[PDB]
């Protein structure tokens, strides 16, 4: 079996609005620069980034 490399690039899209958001989720989303709905960006995948995606 050939296990390929798990990817280093992700595209993230904020898909929920800004009403009634937890503060930790709020801080992680604005560290991801997702301040609006449908507001995607590129992230580089490692442990720290994957855990804050798991948060939001």
């Amino acid at each position: 079996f050939y296990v390929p490399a798990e990817p280093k690039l992700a595209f993230v899209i904020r898909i929920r609005g800004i009403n009634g958001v937890s503060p930790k989720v709020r801080k992680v989303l604005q560290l991801l620069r997702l301040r609006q709905i449908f507001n995607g960006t590129f992230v580089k995948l490692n442990k720290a980034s994957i855990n804050m995606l798991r948060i939001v």
Binding site: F1, Y2, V3, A5, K8, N46, K47, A48
Partner: protein, 159 residues
Amino acid sequence: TNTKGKRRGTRYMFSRPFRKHGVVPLATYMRIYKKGDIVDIKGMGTVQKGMPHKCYHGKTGRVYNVTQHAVGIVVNKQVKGKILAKRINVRIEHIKHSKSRDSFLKRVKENDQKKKEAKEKGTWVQLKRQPAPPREAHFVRTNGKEPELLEPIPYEFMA
């Protein structure tokens, strides 16, 4: 409701561990503390003199003052909406050092020796640390044998 006594709620934290009572071991007394280093605050309950408050139990500060039996520590405490640096006199049975700062200092010295060897030998080497990269494509040998077929079990009621 409740009292504002100085040891309210400290039934378990100021107690001793199980089968750990009695005489305090003497290495805790013969540690040394220079002013500037990072110490953990725990606060055992065999010694009642100089013991820290329950808000400072389980905290971490730096030493600013050394006396005969105690140490002045600068600790961050969070009052309602601000963090402020309190100065507490705590005894050496209640404190111990910080391996986090110890680990940082030994990787500082490792960085310095590594930069010296790189400069003398004429290379460029990595000094920072990077957060756990992805997982570097690879082959998985089956060693000829077929992978075992797993299958969910039926339901039986035991307990």
